[model samples]
Target: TSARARLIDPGFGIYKVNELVDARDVGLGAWFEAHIHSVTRADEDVIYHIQYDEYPESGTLEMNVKDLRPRARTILKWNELNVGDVVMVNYNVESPGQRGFWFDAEITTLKTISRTKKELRVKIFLGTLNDCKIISVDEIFKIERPGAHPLSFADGKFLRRNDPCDLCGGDPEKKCHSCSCRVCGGKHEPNMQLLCDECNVAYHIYCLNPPLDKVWYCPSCK
Candidate 1:
């Protein structure tokens, strides 16, 4: 049988294959889990155009059904990610003192990894401007709506929480006796300042003349 006769149509959606196994192509040499962009037939061959979601810049591959196979593992697309989405990644918690472990984290920011726009820059939520980290789109393995993920680090031993001040993306560990004032941009005594329950911005008591007795709304809310 010819190459076209033995070919089976994958239709649409995602799939995986070992590009280097049979040694027919010369571009991306690694195994890829890709989305089938289209399927068509030429004179004597079925052509499959596919995009590797994990490593897109490797360029699209045009091959027959023999070139690809069903994905061996679960994978994600760059578009499916959004801010506030909790995800688990094989994070390099590796420090000079601490060797890293796979950590569960939240996606606080999404940007391109580089100018190519082929990969994503995932900012892990560590609560401080410096605490955040950058990871590629392929680095993350799992994503879920806001909640506890099954891969969460145990006993709070290896995990960090989202504690960055919403107003400035400042670190919480380095602070004074009182929280920073959101309105005046100064630090005020805790007793003299009111903290917003919504976004965690703090306002001085004097800042709010006709001062709030019970209910208070920050400038953002008001």
Candidate 2:
């Protein structure tokens, strides 16, 4: 039979052979990358044979339908990811920051260090799959909107920031506390800028009418 014909199941099958999926090993907890190598059917039961993409040398594993998870084909941007969402994380299992394999991971926590900085803590889709992996907006994404993506490059490793500043797009002349002084919205004398601890807004130290005291906060925050 042709490859296409072989893929056609005798009946309604949730997955077809050659389709990509995440399958768990019998004694292993982590769901590894695999593809449906073939399918077998008995009187009232069906089984799928899967070959792990990473370790095909171990030979194919006959997997039950229940042990399979759908492949995560799309990439979610930093803003799109939320707590409790499952995503395909491409990180090294050996070390947290090292680059390596793609595995299904669940977001356990989210964080923001600065107004524009975003971070994440994910439990790998189990150590090699429940170890919490931390990441920043600096990595792991492709920009997308309604149906448009940002200007990308041939090599995504050097991913560019879509907008340098959400409020000003890093335009120096724009009136944005995110990229300029909060009170006057000027980029002059950067060394004289005071950053608000509470709101992360930038302010020119000398712009205020009153002199700064031991501790200072922007009028809005105070």
Candidate 3:
């Protein structure tokens, strides 16, 4: 049957076999949907890298954080990325421990870096899939090496984290009352609506968990 007939098929219908794996049409959209995990930054250098795991039989695809080019520029053109922006890239997968080629993508959010001495952190979803969720790439041990301080990168690279704050340390900002009351030394009640990462404290809209709609940055830590 022709392609049209397959669409109305009450049962399995024949289709152009090549359509199943067409490359040019498959494009970056389909390729990205199938692979890519997340993007992370390494070193105070502000370099961005893509992280992903693929099937074993697949070929290995590794890349340096400093090597993203055409694709990264593409994101920047559309205001999808910047020096310290967080972005979600759709990349082609290679293997579980291998890297991949970046394709199309959407930047879920952008975080500004308040200081150049510190690295900025942000989260993003990497696929065209609707269920994609924000991924945090900040959990790893960092060790200092020689004259260089060590921070953690998701891909096993080390930089520096001593600046403070956690995400980007600058200005020696206090954790704030939303997280802690310097005078009370007590944590605010669980608002679930707003919590301070710096102080590991929670706040209520003065109620147990502000209504989910409440949105406010801690006054003390802005």
Candidate 4:
């Protein structure tokens, strides 16, 4: 009933109807969960008709094998990677250190020094975690699932912002400094967001202990 449960090597296999899968969102360049509604074959090329679970409003879209993969909620490893693949990087989140929690990053550029020793630069996808650096061959873990959208928080509404907040992933429950007020963690009347000139942390004009509409500093800076 599902392609996600199988460990298919090389990542591309003949898919089954109604099999759960993850797909690349062209706009955000992130992987999202969807289910295969149907499949199409033209000559030797295969196309998948899939619908995003959360964005049912977006309806179904066609995806080729390269952009389609089996349901991979979480996997321990990656193989035969490419630049467009989204992978996890393990690094310290609280400090500039090593062996921290695994966070999603993208393989943007690649350099083949040798057959097995290729150089990869991954760009981070989290707040304050943004960096592009060396990714040892095995350092990349395949990210099967991606940021989840809150289930139907709106009756029938989805924001069409060109640059939707990546940190929050549009989750209403998440308190995001980049997208929402860092102080109260609310996303209301973006006009009320007065940013700290130093750290760039957003604060609602009313959330400030000593409010200021002009140049201001946050606790870490002030």
Candidate 5:
């Protein structure tokens, strides 16, 4: 029988045994010998207030009973990532002009923005000491271990430092001069820079002649 099916009253109760599974915010496979302190109905789902880990009377969380499993299971999510966890993502350098493809990366720091939003400082192993950026959880698609394949190559491993940048002969963190705004000859923020899908040169929206409104194409592409 399923755990929920075995519940007699679905109210305040203690289980002989229970563990939490599929907790995206917390690390998956976090085993907890918990008490179903109280059960409340929200919409069509059952919210279980659980007290566990020293069985703290002061600490508890409201969770969907669906998230609790009778047994442990392995499931990881972007929100569950902690500092030093190796994650794989598509990262454009400070200069997106030189970007090629998604590559393997590692998470150096974690900043929780809110309950559902999180930011990570990740260093993409793009053949140099690339400056890490604080990226949103959605920016990364998957988390990985050091020896696992990062979904692209035949064999993937966590790449380390002192690598070389093929474009600028500097570091991957350094922006290539070719990526600068054509009109201003200056650096632009990622959101402010409009890239011409045709010529691949980036430009600031305000720098254009008679500034573009919605869609944009560079002069050469037009």
Candidate 6:
């Protein structure tokens, strides 16, 4: 079900079907459709473009792929990998536009990587059902499973932008609610929510009243 797909035109910016530009692995008369993801260029004035997919609406997300060598950091052959390859890295499945969503990833197919001029455009297999993703290798964090435990909540998401600690005006480090770490993308217990009248802080009973503690104070009151 997987094979080398070819792009119809590598140069034509936007072309209609039947206008041949260039192709590979495709027999004569084999029509494939594709769109431009991105054009890699070192200088702003120059344009260095490459075509990989034939599917319309295919967006090219920037990623990084390097060759892990013993001596020097050489680039690895991404195509050498196969489908069902399990791997992990810092990933953000939210959107291809937003950066720094690194987590874990897998190689759904070796056919994802398209060697761009200076970058490797590869499709990655995220754990979710819609794991088939195309991104640059540079954008991916190539690491072994259980990547150094990640700076605690380094990959965590916050609910508020300027949400500060309820205790002190100082910025919170962890899910510093002291009750549960929902601030660090922690799950909330609907029944455990307790609103603080003094500091205007909200605490989850399960996150706060643990070990059947006697009492708890909000960040501001604490």
Positional deviation of residue 95's Cα in model 4 after best superposition, in angstroms: 18
CA lDDT, candidate 1, residue 17: 23
Q: In angstroms, give how far residue 112 of model 4 lies from its true place.
A: 28
Worst 10 residues of 6 by lDDT: 64-73
Give the TM-score ranking, best first: 2, 4, 5, 1, 6, 3
Q: All models: lDDT?
A: 0.45, 0.59, 0.29, 0.57, 0.47, 0.33
C-alpha TM-score for every candidate:
0.25, 0.48, 0.18, 0.36, 0.27, 0.24
Query: Residue by residue across 65-172, what tens digits does model 2's lDDT show?
Result: 767755433556667778887665556556666544445567787887788765677777545446466553344532122222211112122212222256776677
Compose the digit string of candidate 4's lDDT tens values, residues 14-118. Answer: 665556666766654455666677776651466668887656889878876666665543443434777777775554445533344344677777777776666
lDDT of 1 by residue, 155-187 (tens): 121222212134444555454323587555666
Candidate that beats the other on TM-score, 2 or 3, i.e. the better one: 2
lDDT of 5: 0.47
Error of 3 at 33 (Å): 19
Candidate 1's displacement at residue 174, Å, is 47
Instruction: In candidate 2, list every pair of residues with a backbone clash.
Output: 124-129, 126-129, 126-130
- What TM-score does prediction 5 earn? 0.27
Q: Per lDDT, what order, best first?
A: 2, 4, 5, 1, 6, 3
What lDDT would candidate 3 get against the real structure?
A: 0.29
Off by over 4 Å in 4: 1-13, 75-86, 89-121, 124-222
Task: List runs of model 6 lying over 4 Å from the truth.
Answer: 1-80, 112-129, 139-142, 145-222
